[PDB]
Design a protein around this ligand. Structure first.
Ligand SMILES: O=CCCCC[C@@H]1SC[C@@H]2NC(=O)N[C@@H]21
Lengths: 657, 489
């Protein structure tokens, strides 16, 4: 079989075949000649230029290419043009298997409209509210009391969240209807309002579904997709805390009942919104192969890929709802190349200087091997880290530990945000909401700080590392074994903390306050000039990272955050006070081209916003295109140098004001 | 007790003794001479004698290995040299010539001492002669912590490496007063000879540091690389890194387009051991990189082009930089590893008006004269005389390697097509340039001739380099008998 995706899922598929003993083929674009899925595959064929359209999206190339492998079936994947009719039609022109759902169900359910029809076909507890215009305030109050809901005032013709106000009491209902009619009459030319059961605070619970072309339909355990930034989810978890069998059993039964309704074959997944009063709302249903199943597979072992490919041959499944159980729970997170602390700045075109994944009792699905890069015209996802567990505390701690052991170098990421979110006591309380993120991050993003004991431990580990790397340079036995260091982070030596060290063995020290002070005998295990640093005092265990140094300042990472600790002796400490600290030039002015050349491409527009790290234009000289970018600034005021202006000579190409 | 140094520190500056204490080991400095006077007897100098006479000379010890050093003192007479100051320095250099030990000096002198007359010139001449004679015998490093003017500037110049401190140091031959007197332009001391000027414009300073503390901390690290003398072998340090570490990221560094640029450090860093690069002259002639690095625990010399800056084109400044680095590396038996990516020489009238012919020959002379083991890797391209200059196999090179997408040709395809068909029918571009580039802009022809040993996968570079550098440990080559060469100055 041949896949249709070029991400982690492709690798997953070419991995499921291992046990299924199925030879696999994987196509690629020109830029992806070095992707892992190309080498993992048994066969590879090029699909032209790497721009999205020609790459994979070029059905004609793809379907035509499906004539040499011999494979009797070809996976549709989950992204790009997966589950598409124009594609399903073409594949049934050449009479080949789709390894996916049937057309009628797909167009009946994935369609934007008429989904409410199928929803109300059997009702299935669809959105509740007075179905019609509320012409009077009396009707609005009466229908609000009917269910005593937060009103969910929404315009009949309005969409996207415009014309919506949340009413909690009758006076609020009247005032918000008065505002809503005024807003909607001006904005959408419709005064027709509707009132529905608004949700106190949503959790966005999701229910998984599987089926088959013969029978033995099964309901998979539900999942969580509460956390969501810009309508994109981050953290997922299958057995949500607010789970009662009274609801859940009916959820599975109703999902299976809806399944046969449209004769769905390859079930996508069911979407719900759940309030603390344990309701459910079947709508916004999915018909795509969601790849958040690893979590479910961790709590079940139900290999969705194997079962769906088995059903693609008109055979029933190998599992029934009778044996499906729960053996704990799993947590999954997504690693993006999106720089959060810097206003969510995108960082692309950077191959991995060097990276190593966490592999301690955890699972990681990724398509980015060492020496791989991310283009602008693709998904900036790095890895899909998922860890098995049985308890919240157990599963989370694992994630905590596994986050710190993920070495990524060569480009930014959002691991700090994931770490801070997981460590927050609100997240460990047990329950969350969908507005959780912006509720806990009002102004931008700011990572939480360190407690006193954590900073002390970081100091101790830094001193141990300094001594260990110092002993390497000495010759033969003429080496020291004890010092007294003065650690102080910050440019002003904030909190000078005297530290000792003794190095009793290769990976054991006798850290103390100073000489003639009680000693603790911690342990540090670190390979010289490497990232990972495992330190264990008593039971507590920590993992820190070592970035680099200039022999007075150490670049060490603590809880997924970079710091610069200063490790200096008595003389250096007493002398660093008497050192000039000059301030570098802070110039917000025009930028000039360093060398002569020709401008062939421009990226930014005249007199608009500019952010740090953004490419601006590209000169070509002596057969070579450079690319001077914007180091750091907010905006510009200038006149653009036109295309093909072979002038340069250190002119003012862009002027920053 | 912190007497007499409060006046110094109040100006945000350190003292000579404090610098010496910071450089060496905690308790291994033994000051040599401390009670010496100037015995001048002129211009009312018979009084105000000083015990130290403005110099601190000792022995010290760094990383368990011996050293010699001296430091000027700015408080006493402004650091001026004399018939008596220079005697201590001469004695130290002579002793460090008998024993195979290097010398490091921290310059702070304000100029010559006028009250001694021509005795200051005598001392300067003796120091110059010692530097000239002992260059190439023991490594010499110089750091400039404060003002350095007059004719005293020449002795740091002859030394192998000169470093500078950022805020409070400068160096030049003639002061701005004379410049105003003759030309009439008002230029400040920093605008004339500041650390930035010598870092970027003149190319004299080999580096710049932000503070004295950082200067000492990194000077120790630099010292950890050098061999002790001319006859001593290259130092080898223990290291947990191993030649079997996987480097497969090199397969993707070179883009598939011939007009796109990349950073050569992405090729340099994987091959060498982790966090073991010490760049030399980082802000001058950025199209070429030179420095020191370790390969399997032994120090080597790195010289590579960079297509990031000016398409990696050789030039005057790059030629001088590479020539000096190669000469120093060969003088002390240090292996050389080079990475080649050059389209040719920089074209321009200013270049010929500035003597490209002289300067470009220096790098070729340095590469041909060298007798240390050499390893060369051609990543993408090498054209014209630039291929010859950058350690080609014909210049007694030990082992040469190429990557599968390399190109070695006489010149670009356009010029060859033009010269090979004078008045051939128009549109000849499309069906001739492509064919010529396909047939002869590839390493197959150069491999057929025997100019590259083998064509290797980019993932095997570390393995090959470690193997070759281990095997070549005991090469013995000698040049014909000469009093000395005649390099194109
Ligand atoms: O084709 C016309 C310009 C080609 C220049 C190619 C580079 S630029 C500097 C160096 N000198 C050459 O002759 N070729 C290279």
């Amino acid at each position: 079989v041949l896949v249709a995706n070029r991400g982690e899922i492709a690798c997953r598929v070419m991995a499921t075949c291992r046990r299924l003993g199925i030879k696999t083929v994987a196509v690629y674009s020109t830029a992806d000649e070095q992707a892992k899925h190309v080498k993992v595959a048994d066969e590879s064929v090029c699909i032209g230029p790497p721009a999205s359209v020609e790459s994979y999206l070029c059905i004609d190339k793809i379907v035509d290419a499906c004539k040499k492998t011999g494979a009797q079936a070809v996976h549709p994947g989950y992204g790009f043009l997966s589950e598409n009719g124009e594609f399903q039609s073409a594949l049934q022109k050449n009479n080949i298997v789709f390894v996916g759902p049937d057309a009628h169900s797909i167009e009946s359910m994935g369609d934007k409209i008429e989904s409410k029809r199928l929803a109300q076909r059997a009702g299935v507890t669809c959105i509740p509210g007075f179905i019609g215009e509320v012409k009077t305030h009396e009707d609005l109050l009466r229908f609000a009391r009917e269910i005593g809901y937060p009103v969910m005032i929404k315009a009949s013709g309005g969409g996207g969240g415009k014309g919506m106000r949340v009413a909690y009491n009758d006076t609020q209902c009247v005032e918000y209807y008065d505002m809503c009619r005024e807003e909607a009459k001006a904005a959408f030319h419709s005064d027709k309002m509707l009132v529905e059961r608004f949700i106190d605070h949503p959790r966005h619970i999701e229910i998984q579904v599987i089926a088959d072309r013969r029978g033995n339909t099964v309901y998979l355990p539900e999942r969580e997709c509460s956390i969501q930034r810009r309508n994109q989810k981050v953290i997922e978890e299958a057995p949500s805390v607010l789970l009662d069998a009274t609801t859940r059993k009916a959820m599975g039964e109703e999902a299976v009942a809806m399944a046969r309704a449209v004769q769905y074959v390859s079930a996508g997944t069911v979407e719900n919104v759940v309030n603390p009063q344990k309701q459910f709302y079947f709508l916004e249903m999915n018909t795509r192969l969601q790849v958040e199943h690893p979590i479910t597979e961790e709590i079940t072992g139900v290999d969705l890929v194997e079962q769906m490919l088995r059903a693609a041959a008109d055979l029933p499944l190998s599992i029934t709802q009778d044996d499906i159980t729960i053996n704990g729970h799993a947590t999954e997170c997504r690693v993006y190349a999106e720089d959060p602390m810097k206003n969510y700045f995108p960082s692309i075109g950077r191959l991995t200087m060097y990276q190593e994944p966490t592999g301690a009792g955890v699972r990681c699905d990724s398509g980015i091997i060492e020496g791989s890069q991310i283009s602008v015209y693709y998904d900036p996802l790095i890895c899909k880290l998922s860890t098995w567990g049985r308890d919240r505390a157990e599963c989370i701690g694992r994630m905590e530990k596994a986050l710190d052991e993920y070495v990524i170098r060569g480009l930014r990421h959002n691991i700090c945000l994931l770490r801070d979110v997981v460590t927050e006591p609100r997240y460990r309380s047990g329950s969350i909401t969908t507005n959780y993120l912006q509720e806990q991050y009002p102004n931008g993003f700011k990572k939480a700080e360190l407690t006193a004991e954590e900073m002390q431990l970081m100091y101790e580990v830094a001193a141990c590392v300094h001594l260990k790397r110092e002993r390497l340079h000495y010759t033969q036995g003429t080496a020291p074994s004890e010092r007294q260091l003065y650690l102080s982070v910050g440019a002003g030596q904030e909190g000078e903390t005297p530290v000792y060290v003794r190095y009793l063995d290769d990976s054991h020290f006798e850290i103390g306050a100073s000489k003639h002070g009680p000693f603790r005998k911690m342990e540090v295990v670190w390979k010289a000039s490497y990232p990972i640093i495992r330190v264990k005092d008593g039971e507590a265990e920590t993992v820190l990272q070592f970035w680099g140094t200039n022999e007075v300042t150490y670049g060490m990472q603590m809880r997924g955050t970079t710091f610069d600790v200063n490790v200096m002796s008595d003389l250096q400490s007493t002398l660093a006070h008497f050192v000039p600290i000059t301030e570098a030039t802070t110039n917000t002015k025009q930028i000039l081209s360093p060398m002569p050349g020709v401008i062939v491409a421009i990226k930014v527009q005249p007199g608009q916003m500019v952010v740090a790290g953004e490419e601006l234009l590209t000169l070509e000289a002596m057969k070579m295109r450079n690319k001077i970018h914007a180091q750091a600034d907010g905006k510009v005021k200038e006149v653009k140098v036109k295309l093909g202006a072979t002038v340069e000579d250190n002119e003012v190409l862009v002027e920053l004001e | 007790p912190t007497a007499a140094e409060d006046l110094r520190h109040k100006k945000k500056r350190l003292t000579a003794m404090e610098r010496v204490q910071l450089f060496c080991d905690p308790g291994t400095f033994r000051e040599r001479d401390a009670l010496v006077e100037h015995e001048c007897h002129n211009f009312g100098m018979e009084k105000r004698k000083v015990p130290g006479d403005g110099f601190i000379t000792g022995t010290g010890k760094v990383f368990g290995r011996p050293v010699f050093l001296f430091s000027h003192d700015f408080t006493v007479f402004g650091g001026s040299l004399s018939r008596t100051n220079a005697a201590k320095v001469v004695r130290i250099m002579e002793e460090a010539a008998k024993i195979g030990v290097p010398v490091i000096g921290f310059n702070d002198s304000g100029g010559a001492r006028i009250h001694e007359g021509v005795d200051s010139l005598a001392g300067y001449a003796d120091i110059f002669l010692r530097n000239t004679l002992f260059s190439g015998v023991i490594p010499q490093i110089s750091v400039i912590m404060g003002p350095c003017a007059g004719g005293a500037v020449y002795s740091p110049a002859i030394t192998d490496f000169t470093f500078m401190v950022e805020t409070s140091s400068y160096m030049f031959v003639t002061g701005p007063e004379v410049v105003s007197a003759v030309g009439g332009k008002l230029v400040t001391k920093d605008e004339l000879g500041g650390p930035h000027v010598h870092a970027t414009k003149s190319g004299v300073s080999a580096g710049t540091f932000p503070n004295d503390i950082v200067a000492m901390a990194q000077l120790r690290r630099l010292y950890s690389y050098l061999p002790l003398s001319n006859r001593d072998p290259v130092p080898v340090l223990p290291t947990a890194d191993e030649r079997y570490r996987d480097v497969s990221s090199l397969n993707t560094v070179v883009p598939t387009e011939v007009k796109e640029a990349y950073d050569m450090r992405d090729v340099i860093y994987p091959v060498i051991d982790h966090d073991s690069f010490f760049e030399i002259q980082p802000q001058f002639a950025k199209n070429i990189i030179c420095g020191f690095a370790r390969v399997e625990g032994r120090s080597v010399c790195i010289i590579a082009n960079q297509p990031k800056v000016q398409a990696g084109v050789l030039d005057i400044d790059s030629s001088v930089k590479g020539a000096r680095m190669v000469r120093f590396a060969d003088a002390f038996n240090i292996p050389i590893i080079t990475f080649v990516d050059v389209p040719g020489f920089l074209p321009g009238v200013q270049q010929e008006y500035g003597g490209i012919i002289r300067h470009g020959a220096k790098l070729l002379y340095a590469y041909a004269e060298a007798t240390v083991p050499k390893v060369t890797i051609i990543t993408r391209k090498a054209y014209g005389g630039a291929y010859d200059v950058m350690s080609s196999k014909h210049l007694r090179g030990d082992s040469n390697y190429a990557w599968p997408h390399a190109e070695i040709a006489v010149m670009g395809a356009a010029g060859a097509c033009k010269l090979l068909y004078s008045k051939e029918t128009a549109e000849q571009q499309a069906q001739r340039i492509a064919d010529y580039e396909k047939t002869f802009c590839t390493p197959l022809s150069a491999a057929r001739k025997g100019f590259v040993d083998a064509v290797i996968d980019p993932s095997e570079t570390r393995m090959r380099v470690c193997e070759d550098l281990e095997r070549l440990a005991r090469k013995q080559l000698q040049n014909p008998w000469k009093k000395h060469g005649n390099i194109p100055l």
